[model samples]
Target: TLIRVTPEQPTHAVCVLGTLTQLDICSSAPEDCTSFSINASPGVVVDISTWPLDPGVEVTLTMKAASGSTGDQKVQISYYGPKTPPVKALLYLTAVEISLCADITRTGRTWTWGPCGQGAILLVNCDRDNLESSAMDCEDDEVLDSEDLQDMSLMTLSTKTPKDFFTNHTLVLHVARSEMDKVRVFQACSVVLGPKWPSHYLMVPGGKHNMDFYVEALAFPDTDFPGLITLTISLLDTSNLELPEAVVFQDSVVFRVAPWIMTPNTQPPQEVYACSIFENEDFLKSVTTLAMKAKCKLTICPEEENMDDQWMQDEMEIGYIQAPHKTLPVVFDSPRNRGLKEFPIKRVMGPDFGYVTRGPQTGGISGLDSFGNLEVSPPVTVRGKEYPLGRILFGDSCYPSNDSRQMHQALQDFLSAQQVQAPVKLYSDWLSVGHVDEFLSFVPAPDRKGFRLLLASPRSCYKLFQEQQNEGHGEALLFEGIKKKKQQKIKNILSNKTLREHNSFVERCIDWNRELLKRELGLAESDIIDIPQLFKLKEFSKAEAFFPNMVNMLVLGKHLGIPKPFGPVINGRCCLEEKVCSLLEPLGLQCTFINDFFTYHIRHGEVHCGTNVRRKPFSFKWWNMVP
Candidate 1:
């Protein structure tokens, strides 16, 4: 039948006790009605509105209902004319009727409960809605086969602080549907606390009526400081068809959330410099002189103050220094531990020392091993908004011992508790030091998140060499004595039997890690900037060496402190300064070459390990910050 909605008559309601076949909108002035029919079904309500289509345009609609059918069905529609509120109309078709409500219970410290697994349930009420007639073959079926429950009613959920901080929590759910009968709850969408999400998949199974459906709850660690914790719950009906009329419920709550320390409570640093005390006067002068020119505050760890023979950079401690606080402890002395004596210049402006633990000991945990074991991506917010406890990236290979695994577990536990995301652990089995900074680093970007990764690419380095040689600067690359020495060094490196193996391992690991970042972190290949570098092996049993890794450059706000390879006539001079500038300047970084010949490069470390920066910490609360 023809249905008219205009500026004068803009509202309509109809009851069709039959099957609905077609709905169409025809143009005004007796024009042709296009074959645009809305496919509908039986036992459903269809609401329609005509607003914001065209103010001066007139239109006609037609509804085709099944003939010789009997039942009660309803459709409510509101159509507005010129300049009315933009189309916002509710079309509800009541095919199946069921009522549902739920209550939640918290598990122990873990927050998991019941036979249903990680969640808990306390109540269930299943009752039928109002009936329109009795002779219409009313399915008075008492047997509730989960199918009768259909879709979710309310999606909101809430729970108090869980007792356990290290494990998942259980949320016991009781839903009410049919008259005095229990409703089956499938699962919720995703439970998130601040920026943290549960590691396990969010899926709920349907059980017998009257029994509580246990939902796995998400538990997070308290933050470094105590505050209110906000939790969001989005429940999903397992039987939902993802249709227009299908309903999804979402809920959120704010409660008292607190914070705890996983690592030592240390502040982010502003300036970065290496400990120059163990090196010669020339090397010390080289680093300090540049820092002075750049107006950077330089601080040096005491020269062999405690352990003389022990190596400074790699032997001193393991891990990367970053913007947020670190996890567990490392070997470095901090204001909290040895206080001003070890970090004597704590009061000095621009330069200061902050120390935490090296965490727990792993199998074969030795002082010589820890220095390059830990790496951190400057505090990134994950899928959720906040930068929970900051983020740490490491290599799984470092924790070879069960002891190291325990230490690793400690850090993981702490991250879970804080509702902060876990660190990204890459495959770094190829190197003796196995440090992430040797190949990967991040620089500020122009995008919304403001950061992009810098990955070391060996192929690109070879291309750069060929281009340089073709440019006729091969003679200038090395004066006279430098050319012979570099050639000899190259020959020594190429003669090693394990070079191919080491190269293969490094390439494989880099590919896999890059894939991991793209898949899990949603980073595009374009977002990854390449820093051309080459790798070599000193001997068969030793770790692989990188030749002046441009990726190992230290990022200090807008400035980049790069390493100058110690060689022939370039001693204590800007050896690869121009090449270094070419690499960093395009990325919005001012570059400086720190000649770490005797101190770090010879000792298997680079500008990053020798220098550390305490970046400005984020001031926003965890929940408010975006990842």
Candidate 2:
């Protein structure tokens, strides 16, 4: 009724149908020779050493049916020749159907495997959401918290092997060289098999064992790689660390590194980030009012953390990653190292939030490296493709040639590598600060595309001034209340041919972007709102906003934090603000203008540039998209 395998003899062996399994009966026999006959199940076949004239004889077994289909079919074999078994020595065998599985489709608990595809979701497990330690969960070979469970994929190994035969063999876990940088497998079995070992070994009990592995991604998908990777597990002969280990069984599963997804303005706001720098108490107060109205949390990075960097939006961007089971917010730090360079890893990375950034190999990073130039469009469909999660928008040269400037290769590569939310590049080099925020923004709307693209238009500003001049308000002055600059009349602004020519040139610059946005986003003229703005020539013939760029406003649901453009006042109102309100307020947007002239306008940044926001992720999943 019971049998066991000894170091000298193995009474229990497996019969995997497709391959040959040889058993040496005479090597450890107690008698001179042996003849054997055993119970052979229908699915199993046996071969004997054909009674050869030579003493070289052997017995082998093979299954006619796959173990997966006819599991645990018994085949008992017996041989009589030895002293201990003068009557008979018997072998009891059962075909084993061993395999590994994961929650590939996220179809609830109890992991199962199928032929649908080779991929399984892999979590970065980078967040220290457990607060078990200050270090990231991806650190070293330790799992300290239960909250970290959601951030890892469960991989289970199930099999039916005889318990007594376990010590005669070994089981190992493996990962390829390229994959080592992207993932790690953790279990409590004591072997940290990694890159150094070509065939990493994880010694487990020889038989009758149930196992589960917790896998976490070490890196996210990026440019150098598209993010698809795989790993394998196998049972093999105990080679004593010898070369060419023979495999008895093996199974594999694939994983695609989750992409870093950027949130668009159309989504609900989660948190607003602002700087607490010297002389910005009033500015922060205004931001707080709007953030409070939006009903989102506000994080103030003090001067110590910001190192007096008022351009908070230029420092970093906020995003998130999602698998069927877990999701976490991540921040993409910009490559333009500045006063706020250290803030990302030190202050923002913790608990459920994450952080990622690429260093530019090119010594000099352009303003294009700043996060303000990086924005994502509202969920949109262009031509035939639907970006249900929306697409990434970044500023670049209108046309590229050998001589034109470009963003750092590292940043470009990283952004472009994320297959979903394909990035679209627009003309931004012509601007003095070389950032797209100076000329464009998005505001939520009740009708049309659900959101409207706001493009800065110098042409519209010139026309508005002419209308004021025609209405006998030509003497009404701009910068009227600000004490630092001299006031200029609408009539004079329209009369200065040199200034008129300057604004005319930048009009073409913005028009270039307007055309591209329409074409790429599948938008009509009606889908866009051109806000009045004027630009002046800077030292390098690049353009900086001559006044507050109203298009560069911050949107939090229906509330807008717009820059106070001190245009010519008529009656009691700043006409620029009045004009902007008329265009947006009808769509249910409430405008709150903040005076940022002393803090940001002089530095060539405004409302959106002075602050950043972390917004909710999309309802649609990225894994559903094809090609």
Candidate 3:
């Protein structure tokens, strides 16, 4: 009998399906081949040459099938590589981005050219939609801590733009996954914008395919014409992920600064305006719009408007009036032929710190330990520890009221005498409330061992936060560092002998008499000095004067905030009352006042342990309102 070996399909390298029925007929005799194990081992191959089958022909069959059948069957051969290659799949994404019309219109040289010492950079922004995969609703703000982010994220994503401002006007995407090592979503800027054009990715480790993105015009230094700008965004190719660039295209239109918007009385009442934008494929096509109101509001440059620009607020209102309060369906093609359109303009306060911080908190750092667990810590530090050393806040004037020289001396005295209490309330009511706008609040001991905190009042707190809210993160935090010139100016003032009470009203005394300056040192109005300001003095000296009734609230409060607990009772009951109180510390010896004095004292600058814990009816005198 004769037999042939053939494949089920010539094109196939390996056959998944085939039958040996053709070989059965050629067998002629069913018992011809006794149950034989035709092993095909190399070199030791048996001489099947004497068998009826052709040499070198091989076949593959199930062990059960071979045992069930008894006949001369032809074997088949198939080839398969080490492993099969996986098939590839692709997905398309609808994208929108705006591009700058001019080559480089110089957007005000971004953040200026100068020096910034140790300072902070806060990323505050909000989105109408859930821009971060981790995000659920639109009401939340995303605050990003610069320190916790990797070095890459800290590096400026836009060379022309400061790292602080890169994400100022946008919340491209914020996402994370329940599991680690998942797909991540990131954002990129225009190709030609410069090396840092692409933003540093904010991602949750091990997250997969989780992404949400939204963008707004953060800074437009010279948008006098206020029209559409072409911007391009590319969904970077990292893993096997893919998205069509179509969804990345967008056109940003600026309303020309109109003439009537800035008229003293014409500016909108202290309120916010908001709108949604939409566009179709047609460039220059009439654009559609949506009108909506947001409960929470945000704003930038509220005090200053692009008034000099061509389109003003009144004109914008007029345009809307002509179109009716209802949105006019005005379709316009973006400058770029690629699909681009915008929604109506909505004015808002934008994102603030509290709003922005939640996003990262929900998607915090996922660093793994040897045991493979995750850990999270706040992104601030002082003296090698987390920030807010117990929250005893002080103001500049409150400390120096007794004597200018006494300010530093008082600090040294408090440190030396160990007369501080615990559960201290740093006098932040003044500083936090907003007496100063140009600087941030914090106290750093020269050695960073122990330090006092300066607190502002509640209204002041609102103001400080407002200052940052009014200015983009770039100017408010990231690029905000005290300059050498300002330091020199301070030095010059300290050295002048002209610093007296009457000098307070003179422009020359402005630096010394400033409320901000006084609060910074915990000084009172009574403390003013004119010294031959020595450069980097030979010796450092400070004075200690009676704060009277307040325990020098600002001074003593910071001392306790450092590193000790006063007493169970005092620590539990003491809460900073008010930034200002009406009372006087009578002259001479310590005596009980209107109420029984509860003295919870500390010894050796540590936690105070005492038996007689005074409570209730307690009163002390403060210096007369130093004016």
Candidate 4:
């Protein structure tokens, strides 16, 4: 039956339930009714309206009777937007090439959820291996992660972070993966998110002899945009964010309702087996990894974003700076031992001062030996040993080697001569430092401060004098901070009656209840672990030498790992690496035979106990532990 509509019913749209076997449309009218025979499947009927098809267009359809069939069948369809067969989408991963390991970040300002109200979005991916199974179809189910499929449910995720592609390769995102369990008449369609109109696909299912299917889609346009592609997945969820351009289309699969029907039900009859909607043979290759960045103030925002509440009271501001030039001290006074004076303090190179090297025994020298006679000869060398001037001597092929030098007995002899001193008190630069590690910001606290010194020589024992020019060591003052400020702040806050009012009131109530609870529960003063202030001194070794045997380590200046030889050294005139010796650079060592000046400070002392103020005085020495 050909259905027609007038312009008065333009809203009338065409909607179909299942696949179309054969579709044809003509503008002319039919002159004969006997030209066709019609039959209907008892309870089911075909309904067509002109709303989807154009209005006022007269459409003619006919039902022809099969030569041996008892009933006539077929209906002509014409509508404004008839749920035309859904076309499969053509998708391919682009921009990112294959074989390259990279990640892709797709930031969608527009919101979408799992496709077709399925539990989650189907994050489809294709890897180097295509999906295949050796097991003969004892099971028709697709094997999970079976190299053939990368159908990842969005629910198998933490945050809706961008899809992570293991390699930079082609990929086609089949939108239908997200459409699982959806009841839609529309076939799979590809809606490319770009600055242009859209494209689509459609496929026709095979007949009884062949249960296989085929699909094809419309062509796409070309354009150049930095944001080459944007994904705005339309999900079936009605409770989530909705976009203006999203809508449902009519296109479905034809399943045989009964087993005896002409179209054999090779599988379940009612399953929605539309043509594949979204994937490309070169799917993994199609994705392009894009590097994106954004800058904002670095502040800690509580996980629970409570906007109305005041900011945290403990929130503090930290200041960071990259010093261009460094100022170091050169000590002229001789050490207490009086042997060495005028210690020259200079900056050392940064810790990252090495390059990759191949093994020494490379190329030509294969580590294989010849026959028992020793076919490969060793490198020639000259040996010089003392002997009687006039006595002619013939050398022994191999004299008895002093194996003792290479044995554990040598280690025992070395340790037997060593002596360990007891822990002795010393002075340190940070005698009374306060919050030395915190980033300094005078805005919040003007009086909060610390002392920084670049010592040219390791100070073993400091002779403090009252004044900078005081003779000998008479009352040298090491300044950290004044105690009056702490007392004053406490006094100022406590003097306020308004503040004291609550404290006094609470004190009285606590006093009245403390006795009762303490007496009944035997609760005494709560015990606390009184940890002592331990000043950590990092030991460092310095060495300078003309030859392996002739070298000396003059223990130089000391800083709180900061100014020390091991701490972040002021290398290349910039305070680049924070510390000179960290786990990465264990010794702050820069070994070079070309330059012989080895200068860096090591920690020497800390003022632990004294009637006078604690002074952190570090020491250095030059000694050779060789025979």
Candidate 5:
């Protein structure tokens, strides 16, 4: 039956469809059947036996249908050797028509195959979609995670078989062994797929057509996993129980796990987050008022969710995962794991919201583990490339040789592996809290790059101080209304040589970041707006807000909720606030000075550290990112 050279030319090779296919093509050849040749075609890949070494069929060569091809192909076969005379034959090769398809574009109806320009996306089932399960949605497979199946990858597996197709062949759908922990596959397996079950393999039912299943990602792309998950479908022949299941047909696809992406300040504000600690209802009330003015929703965490932790900004950061299909607002909980460690999973992981966190392995976490230390700039094109999602900014400061104080390698690796936003570590180890948010922020503008880089400037503050001092009004008190703290006279502050030199040191650190941001964000001096703020190096040689750090302010659209910098009342107005208003308001910004001196300033944080913002995501797609 195998020796028919021209009796309607039955398929000489039954190949399988795959990202990388391997099929038996030499099986039907008689001992005298020596050499074969196949040519290349349009659809991408295959090994059709190159003939540069032996084009004349001098030696009989074995053939294996190695391909990532589909449809039918024609090749020439010649059993020419010393044992037999040359017999020319035409061989028809056909890779089995099999497709593992999905709505990869998230277009609801458009289904395509896998990878590079054409690929599927996998989102980590991190949200607690099931109220009954305290674990992630990916944990319990018994029930549906979220009733709204928008986030799940909708897929179909179909096969086209010849008239002689049998029920004894087993069809298997699987991921790589190394990726088992990363993903889980569920199939509509009833297994009596056929009346006669195979001894060595799971059979496909009477004339198998199509089967359906759901794919769920167990985890996010972390330091350990680069985030590309793959699944393959294979058909195994179990005709002989003594032999291994021989693969007859196969198909595979690649999916890139959505990244944990941050929302830059420039994105429009949606909600404001903060914790209500003991007697900080005043602070909360002020923030609520400020947020309301910005036209954003406000959520003040009471003692219940906060668990007495007032620092809501340090507990977790608000990021998100965007697939072509859906977007999930995710809370990246910090490894700091303080009183508010449970806040993210307990209060934040909701029906659509997701939660992800990384912990220290060999070494313990430091203050840098807090989300307060994490920040990202608005989208910027550096050199010739475009970072449409923006670049991450974190605290590194001076710990170069020893990384103990730098951002944890685990978190760093996770962010770097995300592949979209490259991180920029700035000098902040010299600060008391060691967070990047203490000194720098990005706010939207009308011109240039559509944003202004706000850096806490000791130089600007000192220059303003000297300008007021030179005008003979340095006697004006800074903390004028505050009764608990002694009023600080600008004259006395400027006269302190020790304080002046310390501020000079702080300026150098700020300048270092100023230059770095200019280079990283592709900025000019005109693009940066240095806010007037001071820093005083306290115990342990770390700095804190000398006055209220004005740069550490909450940005919500055009509204800026800044810490009240009570500078000298020069000409019947606070010079600090006056200067800031002049610099920012001209750019159509509205500066609302929230009095956080007693509540947050004394605690070494300001409005930004005390509050968080959930902003709108970018219109650009993350999957389209080349890097």
Candidate 6:
């Protein structure tokens, strides 16, 4: 009997053996077999060979039919390589039953058989897929983290899916699988932090395809020190029957600046004061913990207990209230002489403090009034009389009937009548509420006189743009570090056609304020400390979006409580803790950072907006000695 072996799919080389002969060719010559011989047994082994061949030429091979066989058997062969290879089923034989013939395929890692019938044998080369090398780079550069890998639906079959019609040869396939030893570590297991499943408790199915695992911080035990958390994913080998599962594969993931330890102990004053609105339990607790860290006597305003305990009338509404003397009561008089429910005058002032009486203003917007609009300085001796000097709002619409000129005039007159002319008028028209406190405030100068003015600057915003450009991440990612409403607004600004114009306008407004400070307060450039900050353009019917402003800080005697800079995920310019602490430490003040993530900044306010201070009340014996 005579038989012929042929190649099914085109490839570099194919090897075949017949009962009486064996054939070897780098590649079969087109239109004819390059060599042919007959010898040995009827059983024949046909395989895809690893020998390299020229892709430039077509390879073809043929053989005669078995001598006793009524049917003629012919075979064909072609060349294939890694760069470009044909699909499975690479060899053919004509002597066997028509449908029952030889078939072969490639596994990139090994060669296997598609389907074999009576008297049919298909062979493959394990080295074709480079199974000996476990270090081949994947064609795609994108890598998925555990969270993104959770949706198993993404693993659905596509045109890219590998075909498995071929039966894998035992020895070569085994060697190929062993080469993937590197996959054992992270392939089917992951460590998730927090309240989620414990490490060893979580499991992933082992399969031919790869699986991703997550290392999330969401399940971590709630803590005040959410800084960094490390987790490890390990694939355990239970193959050893007598021993425990050994770690075969392992990798660690580190989460940065996790939302823990938000408020750290700064060894603040032995006794200071801090207060917050008692509304949401979680929010109140966070603020209370911060206060406790600073040794602050935390006072919680009522929560729906009475009409007097209105939501916005907390300590934050009273502004930075500093008593004239620590020995006397703090007499807090409303700008409008009558009892103003919105002003928190009654809650902030009394006999032990001083007194709350009607002064000269009409309606009140807490954020628009005291906290957002006022800034005070330490008392200075003027004309042989000690007077506490500070900046007061004027020439803005949101105050006393929304008349800029009238509000300005009334504020000056009121301050003069109170025996203090320390009012340095500053306009905040660009702000939504038109409050000076929105853009600037005064903190005790580390080593100087009166006080150091903390002024907002757009320079930081410019630097942030440069940083993104340098990272090739672009400014579009900047909004990730911010919170809700402002996030959308800022994103709109960046996406709008007026991005450059809006940014230019911000710089102009900041510069204008800088000039006014230098002029009104006779402040030299050196006297002003620029707090890197920015504000979004005024959108219609929306509160002006102010970037997290550290200047809007709460002064607690010798302790300074400031809003911590947001994390980079929210587009934070940078961490402000060290910058602020470094700036204030020289002035003999301790700094405490309070996370204002959602409680304030996201609401378009800062630390000062959520807290109020009751300065050490002291009698002004100097008032009695005067005149």
For model 4, the superposed segments whose C-alpha errors exceed 4 Å read: 1-27, 30-489, 492-627
Q: Pick the winner on TM-score between candidates 1 and 3.
A: 1
Question: Tens-digit lDDT track for model 4 on 559-617?
Answer: 11121111111223211122212211322222111111121111121110000010111
Best candidate, lDDT: 2
Per-residue C-alpha lDDT of model 3 across residues 47-114, encoded as one tens digit per residue: 22212333344433321111111122223222222343322111111111112221121111111111
For residues 1-627, what per-residue lDDT tens digits would candidate 6 score against the true structure? 122233443322112222232344433323322232222223333333334443343333333322222112323334344454432223333221111011111110111111221111111000012222221111112223333222111111001111221111000001112122111112234322222222333322211223333221121111222223333433343544687654433333322211100000111222233333433355456556656755667665453323332223222322112211112223333353222343344344322232222323555423333423544444445344444332233334423443332333433344434332245555565566556666676665545554676776656655554454456544343335554544433334344555456656756765777786665555666667766565666664223544466776666545666766652332334434555566677777677665666656656666665555544322222222221
List TM-scores for all candidates, in order: 0.47, 0.84, 0.16, 0.17, 0.83, 0.45
The reply for model 6, stretches above 4 Å from the true place, is 1-279, 305-327, 333-349, 359-371, 379-411, 471-476, 479-500, 539-543, 564-592, 617-627
lDDT of 5 at 148: 33
Q: Model 2 — which ten-residue stretch has the worst lDDT?
A: 108-117
- Model 5, residue 451: displacement in angstroms? 0.4
| Candidate 2 vs. true structure, TM-score | 0.84
lDDT of 1 at 205: 22
Worst 10 residues of 3 by lDDT: 368-377
**Number of clashes in every candidate structure?**
52, 1, 117, 66, 4, 63
Candidate 1 vs 6: which has more TM-score: 1
* Cα lDDT computed for each candidate against the true fold: 0.40, 0.76, 0.19, 0.17, 0.73, 0.38
Error of 3 at 152 (Å): 17
Kindly report which residue stretches of model 2 are placed more than 4 angstroms away from their true locations once superposed. Answer: 1-93, 108-118, 129-135, 188-191, 196-199, 206-208, 237-245, 361-363, 399-403
Model 1, C-alpha of 518: deviation from truth (Å) = 2.3
In candidate 5, what are the lDDT values of residues 257-362, reduced to their tens digit? 8888999999999989898877687777777887888889887778776776778889888899887768889998888887777778777788889988887633
The TM-score of candidate 6 is: 0.45
- On residues 385-443, what C-alpha lDDT tens digit does candidate 1 reach at each position? 33444555555553465323212444434434434335556666555556666777777
